[PDB]
Design an enzyme around this catalytic site. Structure first.
Site, PDB file in Angstrom:
ATOM      1  N   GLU A 155      -3.239  -1.180   7.681  1.00 35.54           N
ATOM      2  CA  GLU A 155      -2.145  -0.766   8.535  1.00 35.54           C
ATOM      3  C   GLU A 155      -2.279  -1.485   9.831  1.00 35.54           C
ATOM      4  OE1 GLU A 155      -1.660   3.510   9.332  1.00 35.54           O
ATOM      5  OE2 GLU A 155      -2.218   3.956   7.223  1.00 35.54           O
ATOM      6  N   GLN A 167      -7.980   6.946   6.843  1.00 33.56           N
ATOM      7  CA  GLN A 167      -8.498   7.092   8.202  1.00 33.56           C
ATOM      8  C   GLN A 167      -9.484   8.246   8.283  1.00 33.56           C
ATOM      9  OE1 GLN A 167      -4.714   5.160  10.594  1.00 33.56           O
ATOM     10  NE2 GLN A 167      -5.332   7.226  11.178  1.00 33.56           N
ATOM     11  N   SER A 217      -9.571  10.800  11.279  1.00 36.08           N
ATOM     12  CA  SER A 217      -8.431  11.574  11.714  1.00 36.08           C
ATOM     13  C   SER A 217      -8.409  13.016  11.315  1.00 36.08           C
ATOM     14  CB  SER A 217      -7.150  10.927  11.160  1.00 36.08           C
ATOM     15  OG  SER A 217      -7.025   9.591  11.627  1.00 36.08           O
ATOM     16  N   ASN A 260      -7.527   0.004   9.272  1.00 33.47           N
ATOM     17  CA  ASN A 260      -6.300   0.182  10.011  1.00 33.47           C
ATOM     18  C   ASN A 260      -6.567  -0.173  11.478  1.00 33.47           C
ATOM     19  OD1 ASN A 260      -5.365   1.266   7.614  1.00 33.47           O
ATOM     20  ND2 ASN A 260      -4.939   3.304   8.461  1.00 33.47           N
ATOM     21  N   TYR A 271      -4.561  -0.350  15.401  1.00 27.88           N
ATOM     22  CA  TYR A 271      -3.376  -0.243  16.241  1.00 27.88           C
ATOM     23  C   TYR A 271      -3.683  -0.654  17.679  1.00 27.88           C
ATOM     24  CZ  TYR A 271      -1.025   2.063  12.416  1.00 27.88           C
ATOM     25  OH  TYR A 271      -0.372   2.413  11.256  1.00 27.88           O
ATOM     26  N   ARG A 293       0.847  -1.186   0.000  1.00 27.62           N
ATOM     27  CA  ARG A 293       0.000   0.000   0.000  1.00 27.62           C
ATOM     28  C   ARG A 293       0.884   1.237   0.000  1.00 27.62           C
ATOM     29  NH1 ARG A 293      -2.987   2.546   4.892  1.00 27.62           N
ATOM     30  NH2 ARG A 293      -4.012   4.241   3.748  1.00 27.62           N
TER      31      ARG A 293
END
Ligand SMILES: *[C@@H]1O[C@H](CO)[C@@H](O[C@@H]2O[C@H](CO)[C@@H](O[C@@H]3O[C@H](CO[C@H]4O[C@H](CO)[C@@H](O)[C@H](O)[C@@H]4O)[C@@H](O)[C@H](O[C@H]4O[C@H](CO)[C@@H](O)[C@H](O)[C@@H]4O)[C@@H]3O[C@@H]3OC[C@@H](O)[C@H](O)[C@H]3O)[C@H](O)[C@H]2NC(C)=O)[C@H](O[C@@H]2O[C@@H](C)[C@@H](O)[C@@H](O)[C@@H]2O)[C@H]1NC(C)=O
Ligand SMILES: *[C@@H]1O[C@H](CO)[C@@H](O[C@@H]2O[C@H](CO)[C@@H](O[C@@H]3O[C@H](CO[C@H]4O[C@H](CO)[C@@H](O)[C@H](O)[C@@H]4O)[C@@H](O)[C@H](O[C@H]4O[C@H](CO)[C@@H](O)[C@H](O)[C@@H]4O)[C@@H]3O[C@@H]3OC[C@@H](O)[C@H](O)[C@H]3O)[C@H](O)[C@H]2NC(C)=O)[C@H](O[C@@H]2O[C@@H](C)[C@@H](O)[C@@H](O)[C@@H]2O)[C@H]1NC(C)=O
Ligand SMILES: *[C@@H]1O[C@H](CO)[C@@H](O[C@@H]2O[C@H](CO)[C@@H](O[C@@H]3O[C@H](CO)[C@@H](O)[C@H](O)[C@@H]3O[C@@H]3OC[C@@H](O)[C@H](O)[C@H]3O)[C@H](O)[C@H]2NC(C)=O)[C@H](O[C@@H]2O[C@@H](C)[C@@H](O)[C@@H](O)[C@@H]2O)[C@H]1NC(C)=O
Ligand SMILES: *[C@@H]1O[C@H](CO)[C@@H](O[C@@H]2O[C@H](CO)[C@@H](O[C@@H]3O[C@H](CO)[C@@H](O)[C@H](O)[C@@H]3O[C@@H]3OC[C@@H](O)[C@H](O)[C@H]3O)[C@H](O)[C@H]2NC(C)=O)[C@H](O[C@@H]2O[C@@H](C)[C@@H](O)[C@@H](O)[C@@H]2O)[C@H]1NC(C)=O
Ligand SMILES: *[C@@H]1O[C@H](CO)[C@@H](O[C@@H]2O[C@H](CO)[C@@H](O)[C@H](O)[C@H]2NC(C)=O)[C@H](O)[C@H]1NC(C)=O
Ligand SMILES: *[C@@H]1O[C@H](CO)[C@@H](O[C@@H]2O[C@H](CO)[C@@H](O)[C@H](O)[C@H]2NC(C)=O)[C@H](O)[C@H]1NC(C)=O
Ligand SMILES: *[C@@H]1O[C@H](CO)[C@@H](O[C@@H]2O[C@H](CO)[C@@H](O)[C@H](O)[C@H]2NC(C)=O)[C@H](O)[C@H]1NC(C)=O
Ligand SMILES: *[C@@H]1O[C@H](CO)[C@@H](O[C@@H]2O[C@H](CO)[C@@H](O)[C@H](O)[C@H]2NC(C)=O)[C@H](O)[C@H]1NC(C)=O
Ligand SMILES: *[C@@H]1O[C@H](CO)[C@@H](O)[C@H](O)[C@H]1NC(C)=O
Ligand SMILES: *[C@@H]1O[C@H](CO)[C@@H](O)[C@H](O)[C@H]1NC(C)=O
Ligand SMILES: *[C@@H]1O[C@H](CO)[C@@H](O)[C@H](O)[C@H]1NC(C)=O
Ligand SMILES: *[C@@H]1O[C@H](CO)[C@@H](O)[C@H](O)[C@H]1NC(C)=O
Ligand SMILES: *[C@@H]1O[C@H](CO)[C@@H](O)[C@H](O)[C@H]1NC(C)=O
Ligand SMILES: *[C@@H]1O[C@H](CO)[C@@H](O)[C@H](O)[C@H]1NC(C)=O
Ligand SMILES: *[C@@H]1O[C@H](CO)[C@@H](O)[C@H](O)[C@H]1NC(C)=O
Ligand SMILES: *[C@@H]1O[C@H](CO)[C@@H](O)[C@H](O)[C@H]1NC(C)=O
Ligand SMILES: *[C@@H]1O[C@H](CO)[C@@H](O)[C@H](O)[C@H]1NC(C)=O
Ligand SMILES: *[C@@H]1O[C@H](CO)[C@@H](O)[C@H](O)[C@H]1NC(C)=O
Ligand SMILES: *[C@@H]1O[C@H](CO)[C@@H](O)[C@H](O)[C@H]1NC(C)=O
Ligand SMILES: *[C@@H]1O[C@H](CO)[C@@H](O)[C@H](O)[C@H]1NC(C)=O
Ligand SMILES: [Zn+2]
Lengths: 499, 499
Positions: free
Chosen positions: A407, A185, A188, A326, A328, A93
Site C-alpha cells: 500500500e 498492518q 494497527s 505499507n 504512507y 491486492r
C-alpha cells in the site's frame, strides 16, 4: 545517477522521465483494496467492523458512514477487474472476508459455498487478464461471533480459528493464488483497536475513552500483538508444511513509517527516534527475524510484555517468505514521558516519544498528506524520501528480505465535487514522488523490492473516515456506485505502466 | 348492546361513540415498539437482524433499509416519552436489545453498563409520566455471536444464555418493570427465520431459497419452536421463583390470527380451518396450557416434532401469568397438499392449508390492509371481527387467560408524501374498528383483556420492508429523525384516550 524531489513542485509525473521501464522487467505494478472497504455486507456474516461502526457510529467516520454497501464490489467485482485491465496492472491486492466464507467464524460450523464461489470468480477473472493476485487473509474484519465468544485476538483461541480459516483459503484458492498476506498492518489493531479504541473492536481503558465497552490500553495491545504474531506464524507454518506443492509465498503486512529526530542535534530526540523504530517496527520485526521482542521493549514494558516459549519463538522467527510493507508517511520524534501508573496510560506511551510533522526549527517534513479540519495543527504531511529510508533500513536491519510495497497512496477530500475529485494532481505527485525514491533505493541500495501496489483501486469506505475522503485512482459516485472511472491519477498510472 | 362495523365506511372514529371510557377504568391504552426497529446500532453489539439485513440486503426491504440508524431512539428516547405523554398513554411496550446490555451474548463475558443505563433512564422517564412499561426481553434481535457459536435457537445452548440475560434484566429493571414479555410472536422466527428465510437468521432448505447459508425448512422450524418454548419457560420459572418479590407478571407474545373456511359448507375447508388453529395457535398454546403439542401436529409432523420430557412438560405447562396477543388479520383456509418428501417441503405445509383473503364465492374478507405492488392478488385485507373471535377463542379454548393486546396496527405506503402520510384516516379506521370489537368481546364474552397497545409509537424500520411502509401513530422524517409528530391517527387516539 538518480535524483528525486522531496518538495513541491514535483516533475516526476512525466512518464518520459519515470515509468515502469525504469524498474526491472519483472516488477509488479498494481493497486490494492480490502474486503470491508469495498464489498458490502450482502452475502456475508457480520464482523467487528460492522459491529464497531454500528455500535459507535461517530467512530466510523464524521458522516457515520460504514461498509454496508460501499462500492458494492460484491456485485461489481468485474468492474474492478476492468479497472485493472485498463491500467494494464500486473498485480492486485485484495482481501478475503472471513465472514463471507465462514460466517460462523469457526470452520467446523460450516462454510458459505457461495462466498467461496465469489472469490473463485474474482481470482479466475484476474488471472485471465494477466493480473497476479496478492491476497490478504485478514484485513481486520474478524467475524463478530469470535469477538463475542472470546474477544478475538485478545484470546489464544484465535490462533486455531485463524489457522482453520487460512487452511480453507489455501485449499480453495491456493492453486491459483501464489502470494498470500496474513494479517494487515500488524501494529494497527493492537494500538487502535485495543489502545486508543479508534478502530474495531473498540476496547480501551475507561479513562482513555469512556465509550469503550471494556479494555485496558496499557496491557491489551501487547496481548493482541502477541496473539497476532502467533496466529500469523501458525498460518505460515501450515502454508509451508501443507501447501508447499502450490509454489507460492506468504508473509505478514507491516505498516511502516520512517522516523527522524525532531531535533537532530539533541541526543534526547535522537534517542526517541531510535526508540520509535524499535517500538513501531521492531515490535513485530524483532519477533519475525529473531523470535524475541526488542530489548528496549523488554526493558520498558516489563511484565506487560508477553514471553514466547522456545517453541513459539522458533515458530515466529523466520515466519515469512516476503514482507508486505505499507508506507504512507514519516514522523519527527521527540521525548515524551511514559506515565505507566496513570489510569489513562496506553501502550503507545511506552515508546517515550511524541510524534510531529514539524521539527524543532519549524520545518514541515513535506507536502500536505491529510488536512484535519477540526485541528489544523494535527494535519499530516508526507515525505517521499521516507520510502527510501524504510526500504534501506529493512534491508540492513532485517536480513535483506524480499519486499512488496502493498500500500502507498493519499486521500483527497470527499467535500470536492466530481470534477475536482477527478483532477487529482496531488495524488499523481504523491505516487510519482514515492515511486521515484523506490526506484532510487532499489538501484542504490539493492533492496529486494519486487512490486508496488498503490492504495486504492477505487474510492471506498475509509476506516475511521467514512466517505469523507477518497483514496481511489478511480472515482466512484456514491449515488450510483456501478462505475469506476479512472481519475487523472489512474490515467497517469496507466501511462506509467505502459509508457 | 354493542354493534360494531365490519366494512367501510367506519364511524367509530367519533369519540362521542367510542372512547376509553367505554372500557373498564383500569384498562391500559398505549403503543408499542421494538429495539431493532427504533434504536440504531450506536452503543450496542451486533445481532442477527444486523447480520441478516447486511448479508441479504434484498431481504431487508425493497429499499435495502435496515436498523442502523432508524428513528434513533438511542438519542431521542425522551422524544418517545413525549409522544406517550401527549397521548396520555398509560402503557408502552418496548424491547430490550440483548446486544445492548450483553454485547458478547453470554453474561459471563461482561455487561455493557452504559446499555443498562440507557434502559434505566427510559424506564424512569416512563414511570415519571405515569406510563406502565411492558418490556419485551427478546424481539428477535439475537446477538450475532450466539448465532455464530451455535446457531442460536437451533441449539439447546440458547436456553441458559437466554436465562442469564433475562436474569440480568429482572435484576436491573424489575424493581420498576412489572410486565415482562419473553419472546415476541413465537410463531415467527421458526417459520420465517428457519422455514422461508424471509427473516433473520435466514436459514432454509436449499431449494426453498438458494441464498440461505444453511438449513432445513422441514425440520428446523420445529426445533427452534421447541427451544423457544423451553427458553421461555425457563425464564418464567426463574422469574416466578427468584423475582416474586418484585410483584410483576410475565408472559409470552403470540401472533394471533383468526381463520375462517374458504368455503363454509365444504367439510374439507372447514377441516383445514381447524387445522390452522392448531398449527398456528396450538403449536405454542398447547404446550403453554397442557405441556404437549396438539394431537394433529403429533400425528402429521411425526418424527420431526420434538418431544418434551416429563420435566420439560411440567416447566412449559402454565408458564405464563398473562398472554401478550398480537393481532393484525384473519385468513380463509382451504385444503392443500403436504408433500413431505419434496426437497422444498416446509414446516408450514404440514397444516395442509392454503390461506387467502378471498373466499370461494369471491368475497374479500374486509378492507385493504397491505397492498402488494408486485402481485396485487397477494394483497392483505383485514377483518375487525377477528379480534373478537380470537379473544373469545382464547378464553374458551385456553383456560380464560389474562390478556394484553400487545400489537395491533396497519401500515401506509412510504411512497406517500408527508401530508398524505399525516392524513392517515385508514389507520384511524383500522384502530377504531378493532377497538370496537375488543370492547364488544370484553362485554359479551367476559374475556379478561386488560390493555391495548397499538403498533407503532412512530414510524420505524419495518422487518422485511425497510422504510417503504409506515406504521406509526406519529410521523418521522427520515431526513431528520428528531421529531415524532402525531398523525391524524395519533390525534384521534389522544382524543379516544382522553375524550
Ligand atoms: C535475539 O534472540 C536472542 C535469544 O535467542 C537474544 O539473546 C538473548 O538476550 C537475552 C536478553 O534479552 C539474554 O537473556 C538474559 O540472560 C541473562 C543471562 O542468563 C544466563 O546466565 C544467567 C545469567 O546470569 C541465568 O539466570 C540464566 O538462567 C542464564 O543462565 C539474564 O538475566 C537475563 O534476564 C534478566 O533480564 C530479562 C530482560 O532481558 C528479564 O526479563 C529477566 O527477568 C531478568 O531480569 C536474560 O535472561 C532472559 O530472561 C528472561 C527469560 O524469559 C529468558 O528465557 C532469559 O533468557 C540471553 O542470554 C540472550 N541469549 C543468547 C543465546 O545470547 C538476542 O538479544 C540481543 O542480543 C543479546 C546478546 C543482548 O544484547 C540483548 O539485549 C539483545 O537484544 C536477540 N537479538 C535481538 C536483535 O533482539
Ligand atoms: C394433554 O396432555 C395429556 C398428557 O399429559 C394428553 O394426554 C395424553 O395423550 C397422549 C396421546 O397424545 C396419550 O398417549 C398415548 O398413549 C397410548 C396409551 O399408552 C399407555 O397404555 C399404552 C397403551 O396401549 C402403552 O404403550 C404406553 O406405554 C401407556 O401404558 C399410546 O400408544 C400413544 O402412543 C402412540 O401414539 C403417539 C402419538 O400420539 C406416538 O408418538 C407413539 O409412538 C405411539 O405411536 C400415546 O402414547 C404417548 O406416546 C408417545 C410417548 O412420547 C408418550 O410418553 C406416550 O404417552 C396419553 O395416554 C395421554 N395421557 C393421559 C394422562 O391421558 C392430552 O391429549 C389429549 O387427550 C388425550 C386423552 C388424547 O385424546 C389426545 O389425542 C388429546 O390430544 C393433552 N391434551 C391436549 C388438549 O392436547
Ligand atoms: C536543538 O537541541 C539543541 C541541544 O539541546 C538545542 O541547543 C541547546 O539549547 C539549550 C536551550 O534550550 C541551550 O542551553 C541554554 O544555554 C543558555 C546559554 O548558556 C542558557 O542561559 C540556558 O539556561 C540554557 O542552558 C541550559 O539550561 C538547562 C541546564 O540543565 C543545561 O545544562 C543548560 O545547558 C544549550 O546550550 C544548547 N546546546 C547547544 C549544544 O547549543 C537547540 O536549541 C537552539 O539552539 C541553541 C544554541 C539556542 O539558541 C536555543 O535557543 C535554540 O532553540 C535545539 N534547536 C532547536 C531549534 O530547538
Ligand atoms: C362450496 O363447497 C360445496 C361443497 O363442496 C360446493 O358444492 C359442491 O360443488 C360440487 C362441484 O364443485 C358439486 O358436485 C358436482 O355436482 C354436479 C351435479 O351433480 C356434477 O355434474 C359434478 O360432476 C359434481 O359432482 C361431483 O363430482 C366429483 C365427485 O367426486 C363427487 O362425488 C361429485 O359430488 C356438489 O354437488 C356440490 N355439493 C353440494 C352439497 O351442493 C360449492 O360449489 C358451489 O355450489 C355447487 C352447488 C355448484 O353450483 C358449484 O358450481 C358452486 O361452485 C362450493 N361453493 C363455492 C362457491 O365454490
Ligand atoms: C491494566 O492492567 C494492569 C495489569 O493488570 C493494571 O496494572 C496493575 O494495577 C494493579 C492494581 O494496581 C497493580 O497492582 C499492578 O502492579 C499493576 N500491574 C502492572 C503489570 O502494571 C492496570 O490497573 C490496568 N489498568 C486499567 C485502567 O484497568
Ligand atoms: C529541521 O529540518 C530542517 C530541514 O531538514 C533542517 O535544516 C537543514 O539543516 C541542515 C544541517 O544544518 C542544513 O544543511 C540545511 O541546509 C537545512 N535545510 C534547510 C531546508 O533549512 C534543520 O536542521 C532541522 N532542525 C532540527 C533542529 O533538527
Ligand atoms: C431435512 O431433514 C430431514 C431429517 O434429517 C431429512 O429427511 C430425511 O431424509 C433422509 C434422507 O432421505 C431420510 O432418510 C429420512 O427418512 C427423512 N427423515 C424424516 C424424519 O423425514 C430431509 O432430506 C432434510 N431436508 C433437506 C432439504 O435437507
Ligand atoms: C363468502 O363470504 C360471504 C360473506 O361472509 C358469505 O356470504 C354470506 O353468506 C351467508 C350464509 O349464506 C348469507 O346469509 C349472507 O347474506 C352472505 N353475505 C353476503 C355479504 O353475501 C359466503 O357464504 C362465503 N362463501 C363461502 C363459499 O363460504
Ligand atoms: C522511461 O523512462 C526512462 C527513464 O527511466 C526513459 O529513458 C524512457 O525513454 C521512458 N520510456 C518512454 C516510453 O517514455
Ligand atoms: C460520540 O459517541 C459516544 C457514544 O458511543 C459518546 O460517548 C461521545 O460523547 C460522542 N462524541 C461526541 C464528540 O459527541
Ligand atoms: C496438515 O494437514 C494434515 C492433514 O490435516 C494435518 O494432520 C497436520 O496437522 C497439518 N499441519 C500443520 C499446520 O502443520
Ligand atoms: C491523561 O492523558 C491526556 C492525554 O493522554 C492528558 O492530556 C492528560 O493530562 C492526562 N491526565 C493525567 C491525569 O495525567
Ligand atoms: C448508474 O450507473 C450505471 C453506469 O454508468 C448506469 O448504466 C445506470 O443507468 C445508472 N443508473 C441510474 C439510475 O442512473
Ligand atoms: C501491456 O503491458 C505489456 C508489457 O509491458 C505491453 O507489452 C503491452 O503493450 C501493454 N498493453 C497496453 C494496451 O498498454
Ligand atoms: C364515551 O363513549 C361513551 C360510549 O361508550 C359515551 O357515552 C360517552 O359520552 C363518551 N364520552 C365523551 C366524553 O364523549
Ligand atoms: C437477491 O439476493 C440474493 C443474494 O442474497 C440473490 O440470490 C437473489 O437472486 C436476489 N434476488 C433478486 C430478486 O434479484
Ligand atoms: C436462583 O437464584 C439462586 C441464586 O443465584 C440460584 O441458586 C437458583 O438456581 C436460581 N433459580 C432458578 C431459575 O430457579
Ligand atoms: C416447489 O414448491 C413451489 C412452492 O412451494 C411449487 O410452486 C413447486 O411446484 C414445487 N415443486 C415441486 C417439485 O414440487
Ligand atoms: C432537525 O429537526 C429538529 C426538530 O424539528 C430541528 O430542531 C433541527 O433544526 C432540524 N435539523 C436540520 C438540519 O434541519
Ligand atoms: C389524563 O387522563 C386522566 C385519566 O383519564 C385524566 O383525568 C386527565 O385529565 C387526562 N389529561 C389530559 C391532559 O388529557
Ligand atoms: Zn450497517
Amino acid at each position: 545517477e538518480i535524483t528525486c524531489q522531496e518538495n513541491l513542485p514535483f516533475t516526476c509525473g512525466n512518464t518520459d522521465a519515470l515509468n515502469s521501464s525504469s524498474f526491472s522487467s519483472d516488477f509488479i505494478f498494481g493497486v490494492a483494496s480490502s474486503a470491508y472497504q469495498i464489498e458490502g455486507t450482502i452475502g456475508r456474516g457480520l464482523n467487528i467492523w460492522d459491529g464497531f461502526t454500528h455500535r459507535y457510529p461517530n467512530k466510523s467516520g464524521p458522516d457515520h458512514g460504514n461498509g454496508d454497501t460501499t462500492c458494492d464490489s460484491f456485485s461489481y467485482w468485474q468492474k474492478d477487474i476492468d479497472v485493472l485491465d485498463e491500467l494494464n496492472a500486473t498485480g492486485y491486492r485484495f482481501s478475503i472476508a472471513w465472514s463471507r466464507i465462514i460466517p460462523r467464524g469457526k470452520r467446523s460450523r460450516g462454510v458459505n459455498e457461495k462466498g467461496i464461489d465469489y472469490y473463485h470468480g474474482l481470482i479466475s477473472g484476474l488471472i485471465k487478464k494477466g493480473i497476479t493476485p496478492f491476497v490478504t487473509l485478514f484485513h481486520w474484519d474478524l467475524p463478530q461471533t469470535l469477538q463475542d465468544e472470546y474477544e478475538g485476538f485478545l484470546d489464544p483461541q484465535i490462533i486455531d480459528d485463524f489457522k482453520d480459516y487460512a487452511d480453507l483459503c489455501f485449499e480453495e484458492f491456493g492453486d491459483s493464488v501464489k502470494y498470500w498476506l496474513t494479517i494487515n498492518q500488524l501494529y494497527s489493531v493492537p494500538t487502535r483497536g485495543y489502545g486508543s479504541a479508534l478502530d474495531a473492536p473498540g476496547r480501551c481503558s475507561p479513562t482513555v475513552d469512556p465509550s469503550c465497552y471494556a479494555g485496558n490500553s496499557s496491557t491489551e495491545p501487547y496481548i493482541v500483538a502477541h496473539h497476532q504474531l502467533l496466529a500469523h506464524a501458525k498460518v505460515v507454518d501450515l502454508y509451508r508444511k501443507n501447501y508447499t506443492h502450490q509454489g507460492g509465498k506468504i508473509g505478514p503486512t507491516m505498516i511502516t513509517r520512517w522516523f527522524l529526530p525532531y531535533n537532530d542535534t539533541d541526543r534526547h530526540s535522537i534517542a526517541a527516534t531510535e526508540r520509535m523504530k524499535e517500538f513501531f517496527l521492531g515490535w513485530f520485526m524483532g519477533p519475525l527475524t529473531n523470535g524475541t521482542y526488542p530489548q528496549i521493549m523488554i526493558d520498558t514494558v516489563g511484565e506487560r510484555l508477553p514471553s514466547f516459549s522456545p517453541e513459539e519463538s522458533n515458530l515466529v522467527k523466520g515466519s515469512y517468505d516476503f514482507l508486505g510493507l505499507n508506507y504512507y508517511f514519516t514522523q519527527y520524534a521527540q521525548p515524551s514521558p511514559n506515565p505507566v501508573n496513570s489510569t489513562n496510560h496506553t501502550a503507545m506511551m511506552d515508546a517515550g516519544a511524541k510524534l510531529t510533522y514539524i521539527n524543532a526549527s519549524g520545518h514541515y517534513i513535506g507536502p500536505l498528506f491529510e488536512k484535519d479540519k477540526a485541528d489544523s495543527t494535527d494535519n499530516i504531511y508526507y515525505y517521499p524520501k521516507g520510502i527510501y529510508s524504510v526500504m534501506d533500513y529493512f534491508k540492513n536491519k532485517y536480513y535483506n528480505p524480499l519486499i512488496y510495497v502493498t500500500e502507498n497512496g493519499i486521500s483527497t477530500p470527499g467535500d470536492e465535487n466530481r470534477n475536482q475529485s477527478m483532477l487529482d494532481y496531488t495524488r499523481i505527485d504523491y505516487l510519482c514522488s514515492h515511486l521515484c525514491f523506490l526506484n532510487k533505493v532499489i538501484k542504490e541500495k539493492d533492496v529486494n523490492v519486487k512490486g508496488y501496489l498503490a492504495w486504492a483501486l477505487g474510492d471506498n469506505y475509509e476506516f475511521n473516515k467514512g466517505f469523507t475522503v477518497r483514496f481511489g485512482l478511480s472515482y466512484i459516485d456514491w449515488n450510483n456506485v456501478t462505475d469506476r472511472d479512472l481519475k487523472k491519477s489512474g490515467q497517469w498510472y496507466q501511462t506509467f505502466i505502459s509508457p
